[PDB]
Every structure is written in C-alpha cells, then in structure tokens.
Amino acid sequence: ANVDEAILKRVKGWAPYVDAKLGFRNHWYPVMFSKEINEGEPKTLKLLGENLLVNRIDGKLYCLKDRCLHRGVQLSVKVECKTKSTITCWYHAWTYRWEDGVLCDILTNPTSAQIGRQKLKTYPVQEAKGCVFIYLGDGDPPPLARDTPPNFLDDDMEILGKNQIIKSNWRLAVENGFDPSHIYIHKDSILVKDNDLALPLGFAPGGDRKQQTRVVDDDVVGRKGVYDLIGEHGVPVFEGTIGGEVVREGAYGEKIVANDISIWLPGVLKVNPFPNPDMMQFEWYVPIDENTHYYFQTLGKPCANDEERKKYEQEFESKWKPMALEGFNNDDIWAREAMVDFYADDKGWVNEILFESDEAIVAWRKLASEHNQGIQTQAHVSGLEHHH
Amino acid sequence: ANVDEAILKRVKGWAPYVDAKLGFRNHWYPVMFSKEINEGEPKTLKLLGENLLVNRIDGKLYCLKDRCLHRGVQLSVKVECKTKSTITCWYHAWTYRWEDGVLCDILTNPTSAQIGRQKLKTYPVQEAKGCVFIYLGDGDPPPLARDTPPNFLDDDMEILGKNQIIKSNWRLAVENGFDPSHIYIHKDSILVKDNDLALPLGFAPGGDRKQQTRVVDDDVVGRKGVYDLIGEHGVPVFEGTIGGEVVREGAYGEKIVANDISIWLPGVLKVNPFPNPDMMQFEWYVPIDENTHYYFQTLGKPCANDEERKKYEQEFESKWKPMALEGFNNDDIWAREAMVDFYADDKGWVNEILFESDEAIVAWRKLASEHNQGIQTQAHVSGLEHHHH
Amino acid sequence: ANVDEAILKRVKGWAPYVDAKLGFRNHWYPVMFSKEINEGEPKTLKLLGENLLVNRIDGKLYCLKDRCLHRGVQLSVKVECKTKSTITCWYHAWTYRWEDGVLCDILTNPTSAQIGRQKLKTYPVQEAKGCVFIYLGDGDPPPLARDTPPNFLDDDMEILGKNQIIKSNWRLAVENGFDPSHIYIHKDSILVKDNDLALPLGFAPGGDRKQQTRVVDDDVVGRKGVYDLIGEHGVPVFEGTIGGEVVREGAYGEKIVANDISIWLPGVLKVNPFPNPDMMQFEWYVPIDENTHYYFQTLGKPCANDEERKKYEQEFESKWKPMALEGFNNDDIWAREAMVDFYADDKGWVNEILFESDEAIVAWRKLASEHNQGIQTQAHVSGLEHHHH
Amino acid sequence: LKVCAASDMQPGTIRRVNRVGAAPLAVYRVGDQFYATEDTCTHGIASLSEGTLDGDVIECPFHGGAFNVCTGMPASSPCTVPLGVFEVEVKEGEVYVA
Amino acid sequence: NQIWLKVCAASDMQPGTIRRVNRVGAAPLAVYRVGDQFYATEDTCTHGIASLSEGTLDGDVIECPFHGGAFNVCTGMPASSPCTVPLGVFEVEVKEGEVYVAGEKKLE
Ligand code: FES
Ligand code: FES
Ligand code: FES
Ligand code: FES
Ligand code: FES
Ligand SMILES: [Fe+2]
Ligand SMILES: [Fe+2]
Ligand SMILES: [Fe+2]
C-alpha cells in the first residue's frame, strides 16, 4: 500500500493500479541499449526505486543491486572489479560474485563468518533487439515475450531506439500514450505536414462501451493488453467548432497511420503503423521512482537482408529519430509533466472528470489492476519488514 | 485545519487566525493594476493558493480557475483563446466561457455528454481606483467597500501605488504593519530626515487595556478593523537608554504623520496622514500561498481637478514612490522575512513572548478570528469543495 | 523522540544513540578557532540545531542564543551592540546582557513589565589550544577535560587544525573514524607513499568480544571513551585475496602510525601516533543539524619552545594539512556521505549487516547510549513542551 | 482589601480584582479554598482571570501556558516564570486578600 | 567430546531459558528450553555479530537484541525481519537426564 486507504477504497475498480506509484514488480523492463554497456564497464541505473549495477562479462549481462549489505553504500561510488567474476565494495572490501551475488570474500577480514553466508540481490538480464531487459522480480522469470507487444521479437523486425529520463510518474506517461483524444496536442507537429500524415483532431465515439476496446487476456505467450477500437464505430473529427463556427481543422494528408494502437503490461504502447505506413512504434514508460520514468522509444521495420537494414538505419538517423521520436513525441513529454500536480497527492485519481474517449484508459486501468504480477512498495526498496 | 490541532487547542484567543495560513476565503483582494492587463491578453496569478486566469473582454475583466476539469492541467501551459469569449484547454480541447465558466464545446468530441453539463469555477472581478480586485469566494459578492478601508473609494481620492511578491506569510506582513513598537526599525529612513518627520522610538503605554485600541464592529458598510490608540494615553519615547545612558534618539522633525493607524479584514492597513500631511497610505498583504504575499502599496490624495492629479502623479514618481514606498517600507519587507523561521513550524504562535504594545496585535487577532468570512483550506486549493457537480 | 518509536523498540542495545540524531546536550563542542572572532565583532553559527551568536568583550568570549524572546528573529540580521556589555534587537529594541542574557532594557518601552523578568539563553564558552568550545547545555558546565581526549589539553601540545561543514549526520562521521576496517579506503592515499607508512588492508581479529576494545568509564576527570584493541590479538591483513589469489597488497613502510585509536563522548577521535610517529590527530564531528556537522580536525605535536613550533607550523602549512588533513581524510568525508541514504530514513540502524571489526562501533554505540548527558530534541530548538497532569 | 463573600463565587471559578492604580489580581476558588495571583501571565500580556481553571491549575487563554494557583509554579509550557502569589483570608464570609 | 558436547543437566534450565555453549576453535552455540523440549542453533545472529543467548525467548522464537530480528529455535528459519539467513540447527539429545548438543550442524 503506497496510497492512503481512504483513496484506494474510493477507486474500488482499479485500486491496484492507483497503489502502483512505483510500478509493477515481477515484469521485464528495458533500461538501456546493448551498445551502451561494454565488457568489464559496469553501469548504474535506478529501476522501480532500486539502485542497480549492470556489467558485461564474456559478452553476458549481469545485474547486482547497487547497495552493499554492510553499511548500505552504493558500490558504484568507486567501482572495484578486482577479478573478472567479482565486485569488491570500496569501503570494507566485501566482495560479491556477479553470477549469484554471494559474498565470496572480504579483503579486510578473510576469517569473517559472514563470508559465504550472505547474498546481494541479483536480477535476471536479457538482451533482445539490441535492448537490455531486466526482470525486476523474484524467482525464475517468465519468457520475455509475455512483457513485449506482439511483433517486437519477430526475426526480420529491425529495432532502433532512443531512451531518456522524464519527470512524471510512469502512469501519466501510459495514459497520455493511449489517450485517443490526446492527438489534439500533435495538431501542429512537423511530422504531420512533412510526412504528409492524415491526423484527426479527435473522435465522435460510435457503437457501445464494450466495442471501444478489445481487452486481450487470451495471448498464447501470456501478454495482457488493450486495443483502442474507437476508430471502428466512431467518426474522426477534422473540423473543430465553437458554437458551430470552425476555429481549427485536422491534418488532411495521404499517409494513413495509427490504425492499430495497443497498451500492454507492464507499460508498453504499440502504434501500427507509425510514423510511416511500413513501420510500427513500440515505446515503454519504465518506472525509475515515484516521479520519474525512462521514455524508451523504439521504431520497428521488417528488413530481409543487410542492404535493407543499412537503408533503415540511415533514415532512422536522418528522418525518423529527429522528425518522429523528437518532432512528434516531444509534445507528449510536456503533456505528461502538465499532469504531475493534479495527481501528486494521489487525489487526481478521485477528482478527474473523464469523458467518452477515456474508456480506453479505463480498460487499461482495469486490465493493469487485475493482471499485473505484483505491487512494488517502499518495503522492496529499503528492505522487507515483518514482526512475529 | 491547516495547523496541528494541538497548537490550535492552545491558542483559544484566536485559533481561526492561526489556522488561516492560506488567508480568509469570501473576501475581495487586489492582485494587479488595471493598466497591467490588456483586452484579450490573459494573465496567470496565484491567490489564496489557487491558480487563476484573468482576461479583459470588451473592456471587462473575467476570472477562471486555471485548472481543466478533465485531467487537472493548467490551461495556461498553452493558452488557446480560439473565439473572443472562450478558452480551449490545449490537451483535449475542452472549451470554456470566460463569462460563466460553462463547458460549451469539446473540439475532440463535439457529441460528448459532458458539453453543457460541467462548469469551471469563476470568481467575481471589479476594477476600482485603477486596481484589479478578485472576490476569492463563493456565491454573490458583498460590496467592495466592506473589504476596503474608510475613504479608499471616495470619488476625489486619486490612488497611485505598486505591487510585488514578498517571501513571508501574509500574517507576518499584517502584524509588522499594525505593530506600534516596530517604528524602531524606521529610525534611520531617508524619508524621516528628507521629509522632516517627527518619529519617536516607541510609546510607554498608559490607561487601561481597552483604551489601547478601538475595535470597529459598527461600520454601516460592514467593514471590520482595529484602530491603534497607543498615542492617546501613551508617552512617546525620543531617548533610548541602556543602564541610564542615552544610546539613541528619535527624530524631532516638524511633520507629525500617522495619527490614524487602522487594520481591516481581509488584511489592509490605512496610515493617515502618510507619508506627508496631505496624503494617506493604504497597503494590502494578499495571500498567494503559505510562504508568499503581494505587498500591494497605495498612496491616496484628494484631487478636485485634472491639474492636481497631474501634480500628484509627478511627485509620486519623483519623490513618494522611491522615498516612502521603497525608502521607508523596504525595512518592513526584511523585518517580515526575519519572522518566517520562528512561525514556519507554527510554534512561534505558542512561544512568542508579547509585551504591552502587542495589545493592538492581539485585538487584530481576535477581530480577524471573529469576523473573517471563512478559512481557505488545501481542500479549496486542490478543489474538493464548493465547485459545480 | 527524534526517531519512530518502532525503530527505537528494535535497537535494544543502543536506543538513545539512534535517537541522538541532533547530538548530545550537556557537552562541550569546538565550533571555530580563537583567531576567527575579534573584539566586538559578533559571529553567527548553528550548533545542535540552535542559532548562536558569539562575541568577544575585553578579550573574553560570550554566547547568546541568536533568537529574540519577543517575535523569534535572529538579532544577527542587523547587529546593534549599543553598549559594550549589551545587544539590542533591531526590531523592537529588546536589550540583553551578554554576561547573563537578562532583558535589562527595551528602548521602545522603558516601562515594560518584561524588563528584568525575561532571560535570553546563554551558553558557556572556553578557548583552549586556539580552539573555541561552547557548552551546549544547561547550568554549571563540567571541566573541558571531561569532553576532550587524553593529552589534548597537555601544556607541551601545539594544536593546529582546520574546520569545515560536511553534509552527513555527525554519527556517520564518528563511526567512519573509529571503524577499524575502513582503513581499506586509505590504501592509495598520497600520504601512505610520501610518508613511508605501514598500513594494512584490515585485521583478522583474535581473542573474545571483550578484548576487541577497552571501555573507559573510570577516567579521573570523567571522560567516557572506547579504545580499539583489534590489533592486540588480531593479525594485520597485508595480502587481500579473492578465491585464494592475491588482488591487492597493503603498504609496507617502516613508520608505525595509528597504534592507539580511541573515540570519546561527545564525539571526538584520538589517533596516536598520526600522521607521523611524533604526532597525534584529534578530530571532532560536531552536530550542526540532523544533516550536517563540523569536521573539526586538529594535529597535536609537542613543541618545547618558539623554535620547534615555527618549524611545525611550516610543515603543517606545507606538508601535514595538505598531505594528511586533506590528502588522507578527504576519503573519510566522501565515505561518510556515501552512508547518508541508507541511514536517512533511520532504516539503516535496523538493516545494517555488521561483521567482526564492527565490535568497536557497537562498543561506541553502547558507551554513548549509557554515558551521554542528554538527547537534543526539536523541542530544545523551538521551545520545550510540557502539559500538566 | 475586600473582594467578595464565600458564596458570591462557586467551586472551580475565577474572579478579576482590579486595584486603585495597580496591576490587577485574579482570585480562584478550588473547592471551598481561596487563592490570589497576578492576573497578567508571566509569558506575555494575557489575563488569567479570562482562562480555564482545572482543580488548582489556571490555563492561560493566549498560548495554553498554566500555573498552580497555590504555589504560582509553571505547570504547562510555554510558561517558565513563576506567578506572584498574594495572601488570602475570609472573616465572617467576606474574602479579603493582601 | 567433539561429536556430542556435554552442556548441562536437563532440570538445570527453566522452561524458556537460553544457555550459551563455547566450543574451542569454532562459533559458540545457543541451547534453548521451550517447555520440556531442548533445541540448539548457532549463537551468532545470521544478520550480524549479536549473541542470540542475550536475546528474548518467546516460546519457540528467539529475538536478537541488536535489531529485533528473530528465529524459530526449532527450524532455525527467520521469524522477524531483518533476518533472512537461516540459523545452523544442531541436534540435541537428552541421554540420562544429560543435555548433549551436536558439534556440527544439520546439512542445509
Ligand atoms: S559498506 Fe561495503 S564493505 Fe562495508
Ligand atoms: S485536461 Fe483539459 S481537455 Fe483534457
Ligand atoms: S523581535 Fe526582537 S524586540 Fe521584537
Ligand atoms: S501569555 Fe500566557 S501562555 Fe503566553
Ligand atoms: S544482528 Fe541480529 S537482527 Fe541484526
Ligand atoms: Fe502522443
Ligand atoms: Fe513599518
Ligand atoms: Fe579514515
């Protein structure tokens, strides 16, 4: 419980999601690209409120908690990797194996009874598509595929990305990403004009509530997500009016994009196709703490051979990165930030006034609340508590 | 309750005033000068903790709460006034009317069930004496005169002044203003020498407790305030001694000023005459948040024709602003700031050791406790009371 | 009650020490060097969370609380020392005697009933060895000797040092200083090579719990302290191994330093001999607030006369201060800072996993818990709270 | 000096006693016992005769400080300075005080 | 006298007391009497350097005096945080009113 019991009892339907200010434990989360972490060059990051160290040893990634068992310092204050397989705390030289985190030696007292009798927390790490995934959870991990949107892991699918740190709770970033009506903020986006995109200002919902989304609960690999289907029965708005006077128009353009929008646990959005008809955008909102998340952006594109990979690498670099990942998504960044104050005291969850297009977000909240693998608490961060 | 109930239980005399950290709700407050806001150029400010938007439409001022009803963003992050009489939230284009804050359009869903069924909070605005006054309150406003001191609104009274954000709670500003012994801090003001003021170091009180003040509960216009009457039975002190020896003297100039000192709800001091016998000073201490106030200073002078107005505005800009509003009151700004730490944990309200001239401050605390029109609460700020359903 | 009662319930061995986040009241603390305070030039500092004003009057030091009794302002905002023996508050001119804090005059009301019936808190001040000590406690102070390590006050001992503000709780600095195994952080210090020191990586302890330390609670002048005796039955570690392979060696010099290490209430370390075999280091970790301390470093060397003392001041300014007080103890500063997050929520005091050399710290924590002269609380800072039966 | 009569005030009540150009007193009845102190709180300028009695303890209306009406001892923070006590005597059921 | 260590007589320990056994050249042990039953663990808390024989026995639960961690004396399994590492359990045998404790722990 990260949130006052009085607030959780009022949002009955999706209490678990409101409680998860630190994110969901027992999922995989991308933290960096494979190229950012070199052989014997440990890197620091915070994930779900926990300081971690990642190292590459004979090509394989390892993840230790960046907190000495002894006096709780970060080892990364001064990294001492004295053998290929170990790290030695700078303070009193408690030495841990990267493989299993066992306290295998203490240079300051080789006779100590603690030797062999303590273990630093380790997390599983996996590389896929030149992305580094950490299983921030306990016990054997599930397959990575369960926590990836469909198609991300496809053999021919070429993944290129951008990662950065953003000052909002991860959940504000998720809701903004999946908000069908938020595309208003993108109306002056330079990608629109320049890649000649069709973009409505909004949607008149048609059909009934249940036809606004498809809640996915039946994926063979265990994925849990929601498709936004507002486009199927609803009418795209291209002329916004104030008392029947046209004040603003949509983007009239030839390229049809973002037919297929899905949010997945633990917090990754898939937009097919985007930002061009032969590409899709996979973007995670990875919880760093209460107030912060990684905006982990990737663009996927099928490529048969090296001649087409090199081609895609080129226009990612010179077109899609600057124009889409930045020129489009930067408005999402400040939109996320604009929501911090209303949600800061956990009261926004009670005090918001939702409208018709928010059914997509309501379906994500309910899906997140019933199919997440655990609530990260301050107890996981500082040390689990329990009295007899 | 903005304050630990253990502190409030101890301050029986004036608990509501100690609670009033964010200010008194359902009162008029000035926030800026008429000339500071142009037609169709909306301004952001914070008042009693609330983010507000102000606009001039066809010469008339309107005030919306600067928080979209939907996801609670500030409209002001990206102002989209898309027709003369509306504002559109930059996020999902919910569109509000300045005039009544009715939700009237949504450009992202013209067919929404919300349109016409929701209302952004609004506050009454009113220009008077070149000043913008907001009623930070619910329901129909009272007349402005209830929350202005005597003679502020007199037709002949030309009001000139200035405004800035001071980093102190509004109550520390009020008490410093109305504090009869605080004149000690002014003893070296350029104003005292260069305008030949008589300024004692303080007063040795005489008479009984009741005589130290006149509590105004009887004003026909409904005004509530306190006059400082320490001078009526008091002995002015012009020689400061330590152990018999004179260490400081008062100012022995010709011009007697400040014969009439009054503080009024919601927090406005009147000093008459000041800083010259033909003039009076009206100053507000307007709550922005718990740590901040507008120091809204004005000087008044009766001006029966357009020659006298021009004569006044010239000596305001050349003499009285820089000599009085700055060269005298600048010492009041850092005096206020110096009380912050002692009152910041709310324990100063228990631990202060008062002396006899603080009778006037105690009278103001009781007055303010009994006759305020409401306590602003963090509940009002985060918007959990007296909105539209 | 500085700490969650549930944490204090868990640390049965040393609850008072874990509570002593603001430090121990009723002890002497060094705050500055004699040469930094000149005749009639009052100096401001914070000690145990209290703002203090120190002044030198006819060469002698006095200390008042920097907080006027009336509205809780720092006198230091505008110092008005109008007679030799008094200070006048710049606000309403309450006037206090340095010698006893008595409210002896008010310039703004020389008839006040408060005159002679109120008292500003004073603290005793003593100079020794060019160092200013303040007794942050109540009533008659003990001799300075009780709260200084053996030999600091010796007639022959020339004391040179420096002082700075470090961002950690004082207890993290104490424990780092007395920690036998922290010597590992010093392995590559410029001073170990440039002064040919012997320096192990650590110690393999021998003997039982009781032989790891000597708990001094029987000194003739009342000092309470712990000697680190890990070296007496313990083997120094000169070869650091991982999986039986040598990955680091200690330093093999002829100079034996730091044989004799003791920590003393209220938090002062004695390291003998250091940094040279003819010298001692005395260092204080003085609590400023819960996040901050003075790192008050001194080096002692017996000089018998003017001649010696001037050579020592040259090798202090040229070698010892830069090579040792900076080049060695800089590692201690960032080591202390590295423990702040773990202890910041007080959880560290429950979750730490100790090993054998931590017997010395445990002995310190119990000694401090049992022989401190009182816990400083936030109530001592703002004003003591007590309700009747 | 004359104040009032034994049954002119009840158990657990206070009574201000002004004086010909002198600092006012406060008279308390604790059961059928009578005590006198200064009216002014030693912690500021409050009138204790406007406070709440609780057995032998007068609580100051300003900041919630308190004194024992017998001894004058501070009983509650923030009071630290003891209260001036005056000698009290009732002859023929007429309360006089010194 | 290494396989089985002679401790004391069974009636020379009140139900809910603890006795520390110092073995030479190895870690001390703690022997607890829970009602009529006897149990033994390592004396040294697995969370630090505390002696569990100076803790509080509450039925079959030993509370460490350092940080308030605790263990089931029967299983050696942690019973309160911050303890997470199981105590070594040592077989005790009461042979002829006489308490013997194993000189080596059960295999983890
Ligand atoms: S803090 Fe890491 S070994 Fe001591
Ligand atoms: S937050 Fe203003 S329209 Fe959605
Ligand atoms: S605050 Fe110092 S005299 Fe009033
Ligand atoms: S004036 Fe009586 S308690 Fe402060
Ligand atoms: S040493 Fe036993 S709980 Fe920490
Ligand atoms: Fe977007
Ligand atoms: Fe003033
Ligand atoms: Fe050190």
From Swiss-Prot, chain E:
Iron is among the record's keywords: yes
Keywords tagged on the record: 2Fe-2S, Dioxygenase, Iron, Iron-sulfur, Metal-binding, NAD, Oxidoreductase, Plasmid
PROSITE patterns: RIESKE
Cofactor: how bound: Binds 1 [2Fe-2S] cluster per subunit.
Endpoints of the signal sequence: none
CDD domains from the UniProt entry: Rieske_RO_ferredoxin
Domain Rieske, residue spans: 5-101
Name of this protein: Ferredoxin CarAc
